[PDB]
Design a protein around this ligand. Structure first.
Ligand SMILES: *CCCCCCOCCOCCNC(=O)c1ccc(C(=O)O)c(C2=C3C=C/C(=[NH+]\C)C=C3[Si](C)(C)c3cc(N)ccc32)c1
Ligand SMILES: [Cl-]
Length: 291
């Protein structure tokens, strides 16, 4: 059984003139656990992880601006927009020290925030995260042609914005098991209108692959260097074959990053939370108890 329900009351905070939605469960005191989704998901991707953590820790899981149940202003949705909005979210809630649980573009936000606030980060659990991809040869072959098309001027927007391919095709292709129509409807909901799909297109165009965009390569290189030197507790989840993090990369990272434990979740692509949520939540819980 992998549940499809989303049993969390909505919470809203005004951020930069916009309303961000977030899950907020678990006890009120202690160090909070901040869950950051990426593309094209929402806090829904955490729905089956949170129940393992909420017994002992506050769980905060925002919807990135432009996604989930957060407001959808008409922005460019550059990565820097997300940085600013997430910076504002974290300050609006008065968070001081945090534990990060981060995935895909949420990992770029989390690592970049950690680099800038190293004293406030007590631990980082991460999976299928943004790292530099020097050559397309490192991108999974089955996925290469479409992601190259996503990163084109016209074809890319036709696929993602007009035809909604990132939601209808790429998202299920990021899960080994078949996503159900109930799960798919939850993921479709925020993007039923083409005009709301800009974030879905800007994100693959900011992936640091083969040196571009250079400014994002730089930012990602910066926080990977910080991660290699930081003593912060680290917990890495990976699967086979993965997408961003293939098994060989995961093994390398388990040796090169300090204080890093790596967990094999079995078959997985990008949305590892959808293929083995029970292992991922139970391991985060036991890791949290030893911090
Ligand atoms: C932060 C990183 C996030 C990583 C997410 C996972 O990424 C890896 C998966 O991407 C693999 C390739 N991506 C595709 O989007 C893809 C590949 C092939 C095809 C195809 O069948 O032609 C499509 C495609 C599909 C695929 C499945 C569908 N239903 C389950 C529906 C489609 Si439609 C009819 C919307 C479609 C239209 C067009 N014009 C091109 C391709 C597809 C997608
Ligand atoms: Cl992406």
């Amino acid at each position: 059984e992998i549940g499809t329900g989303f049993p969390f009351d909505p919470h809203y905070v005004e951020v930069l003139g916009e309303r961000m939605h977030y899950v907020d469960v678990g006890p009120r005191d202690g160090t909070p656990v901040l869950f950051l989704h990426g593309n094209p998901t929402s806090s829904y991707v955490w729905r089956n992880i949170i129940p393992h953590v909420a017994p002992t820790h506050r769980c905060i899981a925002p919807d990135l601006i432009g996604m989930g149940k957060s407001d959808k202003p008409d922005l460019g949705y550059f990565f820097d927009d997300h940085v600013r909005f997430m910076d504002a979210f974290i300050e609006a809630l008065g968070l001081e020290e945090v534990v990060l649980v981060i995935h895909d573009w949420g990992s770029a936000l989390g690592f970049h925030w950690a680099k800038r606030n190293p004293e406030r980060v007590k631990g980082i659990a991460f999976m299928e995260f943004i790292r530099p991809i020097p050559t397309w040869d490192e991108w999974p072959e089955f996925a290469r042609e479409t992601f190259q098309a996503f990163r084109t001027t016209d074809v890319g927007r036709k696929l993602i914005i007009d035809q909604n391919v990132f939601i209808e095709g790429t998202l299920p292709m990021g899960v080994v098991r078949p996503l159900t129509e109930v799960e798919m409807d939850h993921y479709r909901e925020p993007f039923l209108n083409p005009v709301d799909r800009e974030p879905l297109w800007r994100f693959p165009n900011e992936l640091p692959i083969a040196g571009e965009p250079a400014n994002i390569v730089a930012l990602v290189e910066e926080y990977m260097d910080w991660l290699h030197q930081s003593p912060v507790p680290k917990l890495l989840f990976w699967g086979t074959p993965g997408v961003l993090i293939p098994p060989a990369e995961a093994a390398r990272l388990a040796k090169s990053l300090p204080n890093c434990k790596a967990v094999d979740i079995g078959p997985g692509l990008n949305l590892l939370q959808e293929d083995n949520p029970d292992l991922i939540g139970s391991e985060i819980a036991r890791w949290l108890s030893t911090l």
